[PDB]
Design a protein around this ligand. Structure first.
Ligand SMILES: [Ca+2]
Ligand SMILES: [Ca+2]
Length: 476
């Protein structure tokens, strides 16, 4: 439930509707352009727990659970869960309050945490904000519970960004006035009981920049478990300060330079080394941010480049950076959907192969991370530090002196020449034996402390003291 506890977790983010069906189908059609319920359920999930778990994940984040407007709107169905009308009732398309129960239960039983996405900024309604029937919302049954109708025309304007409505003339999202002790009151109450009732460990919160700053603290205190919020802004100067009002925020400041460093063979490694330091110095606790390169609101990685060397590099950055690693369902199967709705593909259609290239990379990076933290209680709080950078390389170091992992990432791609990198600044002793745990090869520390790192095929390299791998299963 705890911030301090969520520090050692790694999350699999899935859209309930699109991860796993109850009949375990792997072929049922799911056309994204149609934007309708495809059929995923909470039972399908419980049924594919070994698939998540064998990638080394320790928790899953699932989309909102509240009862949605019922219509098929001009923009599709509420399959994503972000247009609620009734929060004391569940979206019957995913299952039953029992099902939601079993899942929290299968998870907990396997040592996993359950994170649930929640909305507080708004409701959803099929029509013009002007004709809304506030009598459908439960419990916000009067327009008196809502800011008056206006749409955000300028986002650089923060009071209108928080007080006007998101959405449009087609699908309107009635904006609550969270300023009133009533809105508040009910919202604090609800969050708290919801958590209790299904036993979830953390909350992912939507549209945080749309609610004025002051609502959150009590939101976060009432919930009683870790809250990570969505602040959709790339400026650390705008986003980080929310850390002053809730445990963590999603790493959007790192997202933009990370994508840009690995999306091309010419990506800038400077912008990323630089952003890694800025977030480390200016954000309250970089160790409580969530790292990500893909989600359902942005084109997937492989839409920008089909190179698997590059895909392999960004996946290993996210698992090994400071914070909670988050991988979006489909990333591991190299899905390449573009903007919404193309980036909400059903995971089942890949067949759920555990021998996929990104599946294996992800699994072997979660492996090391999971073990290091078994043996270095300082790892989750040691701040990642870029020790080196070149036009096609960056290398970082995290973990207590003596038990430190040194990751070497590169953007040379699936060609990328074969040459030796003499990496200085690792801080391993001379003559010490290191294991590259991705490829399970060994290298020996210099004499001068330099590590002759063998590079090829633009592959990521992750080093760790061979000695420290022991009663370890990492490379046998
Ligand atoms: Ca608002
Ligand atoms: Ca959102």
């Amino acid at each position: 439930a705890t911030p301090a506890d969520w520090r050692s977790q790694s999350i699999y983010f899935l859209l309930t509707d699109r991860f796993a069906r109850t009949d375990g189908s792997t072929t049922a059609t799911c056309n994204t352009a149609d934007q309708k319920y495809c059929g995923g359920t909470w039972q399908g999930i419980i049924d594919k727990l070994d698939y998540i778990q064998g990638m080394g994940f320790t928790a899953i984040w699932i989309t909102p659970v509240t009862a949605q407007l019922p219509q098929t709107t001009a923009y599709g169905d509420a399959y994503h869960g972000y247009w609620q009308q009734d929060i004391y009732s569940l979206n019957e398309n995913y299952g039953t309050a029992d099902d939601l129960k079993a899942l929290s239960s299968a998870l907990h039983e396997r040592g996993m945490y359950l994170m649930v996405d929640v909305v507080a900024n708004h409701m959803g309604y099929d029509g013009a904000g002007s004709s809304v029937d506030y009598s459908v919302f439960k419990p916000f049954s009067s327009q008196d519970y809502f800011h008056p109708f206006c749409f955000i025309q300028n986002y650089e304007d923060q009071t209108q960004v928080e007080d006007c409505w998101l959405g449009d003339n087609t699908v309107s999202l009635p904006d609550l006035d969270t300023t009133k002790d009533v809105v508040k009151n009910e919202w604090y109450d609800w969050v708290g009981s919801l958590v209790s009732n299904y036993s979830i460990d953390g909350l992912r919160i939507d549209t945080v920049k749309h609610v004025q700053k002051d609502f959150w603290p009590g939101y976060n205190k009432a919930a009683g478990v870790y809250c990570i919020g969505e602040v959709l802004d790339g400026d650390p100067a705008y986003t980080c300060p929310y850390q002053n009002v809730m445990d963590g925020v999603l790493n959007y400041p790192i997202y933009y330079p990370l994508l840009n460093a690995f999306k091309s063979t010419s990506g800038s490694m400077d912008d990323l080394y630089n952003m890694i330091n800025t977030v480390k110095s200016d954000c309250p606790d970089s160790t409580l941010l969530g790292t990500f390169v893909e989600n359902h609101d942005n084109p997937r990685f492989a839409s920008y480049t089909n190179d698997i060397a590059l895909a392999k590099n960004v996946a290993a950055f996210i698992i090994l950076n400071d914070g909670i690693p988050i991988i979006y369902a489909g990333q591991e199967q190299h899905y390449a959907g573009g903007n919404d709705p193309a980036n909400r593909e059903a995971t089942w259609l890949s067949g759920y192969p555990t021998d996929s290239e990104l599946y294996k990379l992800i699994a072997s990076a979660n492996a090391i991370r999971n073990y290091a933290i078994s043996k270095d209680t300082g790892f989750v709080t040691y701040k990642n530090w870029p020790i080196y950078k070149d036009d096609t390389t960056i290398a970082m170091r995290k973990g207590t002196d003596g038990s430190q992992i040194v990751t070497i990432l590169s953007n040379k791609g699936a060609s990328g020449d074969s040459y030796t990198l003499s990496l200085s600044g690792a801080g391993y002793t001379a003559g010490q034996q290191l294991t590259e745990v991705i490829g399970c090869t060994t290298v020996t520390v210099g004499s001068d402390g330099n590590v002759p790192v063998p590079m090829a095929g633009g592959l990521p390299r992750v080093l760790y003291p061979t000695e420290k791998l022991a009663g370890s299963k990492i490379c046998s």
